[PDB]
From a paper:
The asymmetric unit membrane (AUM), primarily composed of the uroplakin complex, constitutes a critical permeability barrier in fulfilling this role. UPIa and UPIb have four transmembrane domains and belong to the [name] family. Meanwhile, UPII and UPIIIa each possess a single transmembrane domain and form Ia/II and Ib/IIIa heterodimers within the endoplasmic reticulum (ER) in conjunction with UPIa and UPIb, respectively. The uroplakin complex also plays a crucial role in the development of urinary tract infections, as it facilitates Escherichia coli’s attachment to the urothelium.
In this study, we utilized cryo-electron microscopy to elucidate the three-dimensional structure of the uroplakin complex within the porcine AUM. Subsequently, we performed single particle analysis on AUM samples tilted up to 55°, resulting in a global resolution of 3.5 Å, with 3.2 Å and 6.3 Å resolutions in the transverse and vertical directions, respectively. Our findings unveiled that the uroplakin complexes are situated within hexagonally arranged crystalline lipid membrane domains, rich in hexosylceramides. However, our high-resolution reconstruction revealed that Ia/II and Ib/IIIa heterodimers constitute the outer and inner subdomains, respectively. However, our findings suggest that the prosequence forms the external surface of the complex through the formation of several beta sheets. Moreover, our reconstruction uncovered the presence of carbohydrate chains on six N-glycosylated residues, namely UPIa Asn169, UPIb Asn131, UPII Asn28, Asn57, UPIIIa Asn139, and Asn170 in accordance with previous studies. With these extracellular domains of UPII and UPIIIa, uroplakin heterotetramer overall adopts a Y-shaped conformation, which creates a substantial groove that may also provide a binding interface for other proteins (white arrow). Adjacent heterotetramers are connected through arches formed by the UPII and UPIIIa extracellular domains. Our map and model suggest that the hexameric complex is assembled through three inter-subunit interfaces: the Ia-Ib, II-IIIa, and IIIa-IIIa interfaces. The UPIIIa extends its loop 137–161 into the groove of an adjacent IIIa, forming an interface stabilized by a hydrophobic cluster composed of Pro146 of IIIa, Leu66, and Trp182 of the adjacent IIIa.
Numbering used by the authors:
A (entry chain A): 10 to 257
B (entry chain D): 7 to 260
C (entry chain C): 19 to 236
D (entry chain B): 26 to 88, 102 to 184
Write the structure that this text describes.
């Protein structure tokens, strides 16, 4: 007739799933809010997942809340057919959240195992006349002077590779974006030769890929590992739930 | 029949819940500080649109749970359940009444005057008296430079304003070289001028030549009508099911 | 003769008379309607300010050679007029198209053909070796008057001249605390929201109480 | 008959195309200098000449290096001086320098290098999917009998 010692296990286990499901619902919405404006940066290369993980997960997290509240109810009520409907709702949310975990992680390394997969976009689209050239140059010229950096390898990407910039900008005048110079509060350059020749202090010398990588990495693990953490609690609760369904 | 009554009740409750979620979503949309706008509003403790929205998040979750509570109660036909339900919703009703009114009270002050004060006072300052005065004098200056340098407007009415009033910028910078912000000339892609003498004179289309009030007001104006009227509609939906539910409750045999 | 200088045309100079500066039209055709163009020529601008003794403003010496007066020795143009700028005589047919000044190539030379600017050079009072015609920032709240004069460079006499301008006023400042940051107005929505959402609670209370009473009855 | 210095302290002097050179010593100042540059593979010398500037000590920024360009990418160039002050003369021995090559943005082969995070997640979760599916199947199998 099923021990109270196992009833309590389903109660605590559902309560833990409930809370971590609500927290995952909150976190995954916080990914989709795009705290760093990287939704433009993915979409030029396409086949996206880092946000698709979150857009799967928001509903999966709220799913975990609702089936788990019901699950606490079913455990106290000890009704055979209610425990069946605990299994046969949870295990679908489970499969969707697996996809959220896998999708969110898999794209991460497909683009931030090395910076060059992102660098290709900057060399193509920076200040470039085509439609997405303007769109993504709004992302970049904001990142640049919001955070003081000239590129992923600072004032050298712009000579380490071919980019749209060369073809409009003969390098003898600017070997790097003019927005790489530090600008006064009047927005004027601090010295001309001091940026056209470039001492290491008037230039924004930092590597921009830190912000881009740390954004992508942080959004990812929030989906991916919190997902696995819910799921690793769901297995033992769902296994105990098999034993409940087969004892009652 | 009574059954029909129950049906009506449950349907209104369902609507209450879906409003809780859609309110939660709307709140998150504005609480996002979406193009910032913290910097123009933390400048005056002009934050009740956001404060209302935060209130909107937790009442939004609260209303969802209370709704299902209600259905559960109605169905279960339990006096105490209904009672508690009543109490809780009453509380939540108060908090969203508060959010509604606080957003609604705030927005009338968003004006071509208010944003012209903060711009004349707090831009390019370099002599603030105190730390949180310097912390406000940064964020205002940054926000005016985002709007002027990418969204191509200048001043609140226009490139008039800097040339008719005293300002923080003005005491730092003499007009003969800085007749209004350098952020207001049209620069070419080298991020230096089309021609500066023509931007000094105001020859039309060498400079950002429109006010920004529309950019500043437009989002704030949506946030305003947004939370407040949606809360009011919920506070009506809840009011008539509260009366009905109460009625039913009262008609419970002991 | 109404040989009067002018504030530069307000069609395309939207901010012109700033707190310390004014742009003026140049003397286009002005000295040359009776065909004066017969050799090299230059023009001086003098600036002056209203005061009772200023009717002694003899912009030339008695022997017809111009005053060598400057912003220092005139105290900003009070104790006499001062030689605020110079340029060469434009031969009238050049007629800058104010419409076409959007050709970024030509823009600066069109402005340099069309006008002169007074107030421009904040530095020039300081440097002890800038032995040039200093065009300093003009003082706020001052009505100025302006006068172009023609000089016959081959013999060194003023040839003839304009009349002083009608008074040109700088921009002048409201102190920024004067901007009443109240609206006076009320929206529409505030008043409905405050009045209805204040009303609603009372009714709920009433109803609740009534519920109580009903349940106590039965 | 000096040796050129190397201003690699304040800046980055190597580049695609243009490079930076130290001015001649203050012994020479007001003198007439010719810089000479030579692409290593060839006899191909190029002359550019200027007066030796007044010694502004260490006051920062002007062309205070000389700048040299049309130094086409990947090329090793030697750099050298001949200078004069009166009928007296001055010199230095060559020094070699090398300019970066060009690289294609479309020649970015995807540097795709998987972390163990991905692969640990995939294995762990595919195992968990398997275990739950199997479990669910076996649970309902047993319950079918009761
Ligand atoms: C606003 O007010 C400022 C400051 O009051 C004025 O700026 C100064 O203008 C004077 C004009 O006389 C500049 O004078 C210098 O004169 C030198 C003359 O030296 C010999 O060499 C020249 C050839 O160059 C011979 O023809 C001459 O006979 C002498 O034998 C020039 O050599 C100087 O040129 C150098 O300095 C300038 C300024 O840095 C550079 O642009 C040149 O490329 C060159 O390096 C110069 O002409 C004086 O230097 C200016 N000072 C400043 C601070 O700018 C403005 O004229 C005034 N503007 C307006 C519109 O009112
Ligand atoms: C430094 O002083 C020397 C010596 O005057 C300058 O070098 C060269 O001097 C010769 C003779 O005075 C000049 O020769 C003539 O050159 C023309 C071309 O400019 C050529 O067609 C004639 O056949 C004749 O050879 C020459 O102009 C001059 N310049 C060069 C580059 O040869 C030198 O220019 C001075 N450098 C500086 C920095 O002033
Ligand atoms: C990308 O840029 C870096 C510098 O940001 C280049 O680094 C070179 O490194 C070697 C060895 O340390 C030095 O001899 C060179 O002087 C460096 N270059 C410069 C400009 O100083 C690096 O070569 C570039 N890589 C690619 C693949 O282009
Ligand atoms: C400036 O005025 C003088 C004086 O009238 C003009 O020069 C004289 O012209 C007469 C008549 O042709 C000649 O007899 C004299 O020899 C001239 N003087 C000299 C010193 O040559 C002069 O033409 C006028 N110049 C301008 C630019 O108007
Ligand atoms: C800077 O702003 C403060 C108020 O925020 C004001 O008191 C001060 O006068 C301003 N600075 C200048 C230079 O006027
Ligand atoms: C050049 O540098 C070397 C090595 O430091 C030094 O021995 C020599 O005296 C210097 N001068 C000359 C003329 O070679």
């Amino acid at each position: 007739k099923g021990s109270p010692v196992v009833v309590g296990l389903l109660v605590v286990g559902n309560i833990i799933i409930l809370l971590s499901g609500l927290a995952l619902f909150a976190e995954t919405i916080w990914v989709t809010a795009d705290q760093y404006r990287v939704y433009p940066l993915m979409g030029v290369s396409g086949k996206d997942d880092v946000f698709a993980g979150a857009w799967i997960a928001i509903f999966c997290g709220f799913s975990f809340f609702v089936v788990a509240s019901f699950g606490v109810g079913a455990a106290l009520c000890r009704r055979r057919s209610m425990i069946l409907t605990y299994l046969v709702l949870m295990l679908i949310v489970y499969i969707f959240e697996c996809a959220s975990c896998i999708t969110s992680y898999t794209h991460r390394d497909y683009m931030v195992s090395n910076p060059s997969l992102i660098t290709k976009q900057m060399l193509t689209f920076y200040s470039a006349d085509s439609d997405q050239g303007r769109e993504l140059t709004r992302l970049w010229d904001r990142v640049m002077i919001e955070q003081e950096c000239c590129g992923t390898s600072g004032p050298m990407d712009w000579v380490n590779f071919t980019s749209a910039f060369r073809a409009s900008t003969p390098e003898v005048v600017f070997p790097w974006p003019p927005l790489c110079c530090r600008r006064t509060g009047n927005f004027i350059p601090v010295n001309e030769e001091g940026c056209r020749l470039g001492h290491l202090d008037y230039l924004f010398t930092k590597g921009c890929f830190e912000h881009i990588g740390h954004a992508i990495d942080s959004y990812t693990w929030g989906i991916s590992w919190f997902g696995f953490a819910i799921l690793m609690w769901t297995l033992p609760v769902m296994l105990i739930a098999m034993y409940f369904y087969t004892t009652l | 029949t009574v059954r029909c009554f129950q049906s009506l009740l449950v349907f209104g409750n369902v609507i209450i819940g879906m409003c809780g979620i859609a309110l939660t979503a709307e709140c998150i949309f504005f609480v996002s500080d979406q193009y910032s706008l913290y910097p123009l509003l933390e400048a005056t403790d002009n934050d009740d649109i956001y404060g209302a929205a935060w209130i909107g998040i937790f009442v939004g979750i609260c209303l969802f749970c209370l709704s299902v509570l209600g259905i559960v109660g109605i169905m279960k036909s339990n006096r105490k359940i209904l009672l508690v339900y009543f109490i809780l919703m009453f509380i939540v009703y108060g908090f969203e009444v508060a959010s509604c009114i606080t957003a609604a009270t705030q927005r009338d002050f968003f004006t071509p005057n208010l944003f012209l004060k903060q711009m004349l006072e707090r831009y390019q300052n370099n002599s603030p008296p105190s730390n949180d005065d310097k912390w406000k004098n940064n964020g205002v200056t940054k926000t005016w430079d985002r709007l002027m340098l990418q969204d191509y407007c200048c001043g609140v009415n226009g490139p008039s304003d800097w040339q008719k009033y005293t300002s923080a910028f003005r005491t730092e910078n003499n007009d003969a070289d800085y007749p209004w912000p350098r952020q207001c000339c049209v620069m070419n892609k080298l991020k230096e001028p089309l021609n500066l003498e023509a931007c000094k004179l105001g020859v039309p289309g060498y400079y950002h030549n429109q006010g920004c009030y529309e950019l500043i007001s437009g989002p704030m104006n949506r946030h305003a009508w947004g939370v407040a009227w949606f809360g009011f509609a919920i506070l009506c939906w809840t009011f008539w099911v509260l009366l009905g539910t109460m009625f039913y409750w009262s008609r419970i045999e002991y | 003769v109404n040989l009067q200088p002018q504030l530069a045309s307000v069609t395309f100079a939207t901010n012109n008379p700033t707190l310390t500066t004014v742009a003026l039209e140049k003397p286009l055709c002005m000295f040359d309607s009776s065909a004066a163009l017969h050799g090299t020529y230059e023009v001086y601008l003098y600036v002056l300010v209203d005061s009772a003794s200023s009717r002694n403003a003899s912009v030339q010496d008695s022997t017809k050679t111009p005053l060598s007066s400057t912003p220092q020795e005139t105290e900003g143009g009070r104790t006499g007029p001062y030689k605020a700028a110079a340029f060469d005589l434009a031969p009238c047919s050049d007629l800058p198209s104010l419409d076409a000044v959007r050709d970024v190539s030509q823009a600066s030379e069109i402005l340099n053909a069309y006008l002169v600017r007074v107030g421009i050079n904040g530095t020039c009072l300081s440097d002890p070796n800038f032995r040039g015609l200093c065009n300093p920032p003009l003082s706020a709240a001052t009505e100025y008057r302006f006068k172009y004069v023609l000089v016959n460079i081959s013999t060194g006499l003023v040839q003839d001249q304009t009349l002083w301008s009608d008074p040109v006023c700088t921009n002048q400042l409201t102190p920024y605390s004067a901007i009443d940051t109240w609206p006076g107005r009320r929206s529409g929505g505030m008043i409905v929201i405050t009045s209805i959402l204040g009303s609603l609670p009372f009714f709920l209370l009433v109803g609740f109480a009534g519920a109580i009473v009903l349940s106590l009855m039965d | 008959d000096f040796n050129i210095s190397s201003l690699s302290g304040p800046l980055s002097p190597a580049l695609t195309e243009s490079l930076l050179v130290a001015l001649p010593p203050c012994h020479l100042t007001g003198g007439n200098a010719t810089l000479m540059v030579r692409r290593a593979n060839d006899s191909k010398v190029v002359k550019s000449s200027f007066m030796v500037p007044p010694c502004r000590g260490r006051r920062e920024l002007v062309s205070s290096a000389y700048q040299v360009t049309n130094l086409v990418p990947g090329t090793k160039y030697y750099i050298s001086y001949l200078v004069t002050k009166g009928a007296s003369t001055e010199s230095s021995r060559e020094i070699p320098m090398s300019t970066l090559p060009r690289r294609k943005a479309e020649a970015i082969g995807l540097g795709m290098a998987p972390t163990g995070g991905m692969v640990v997640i995939q294995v762990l979760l595919s195992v968990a999917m398997f275990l739950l599916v199997v479990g669910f199947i076996t649970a309902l199998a047993l319950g079918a009998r009761k």
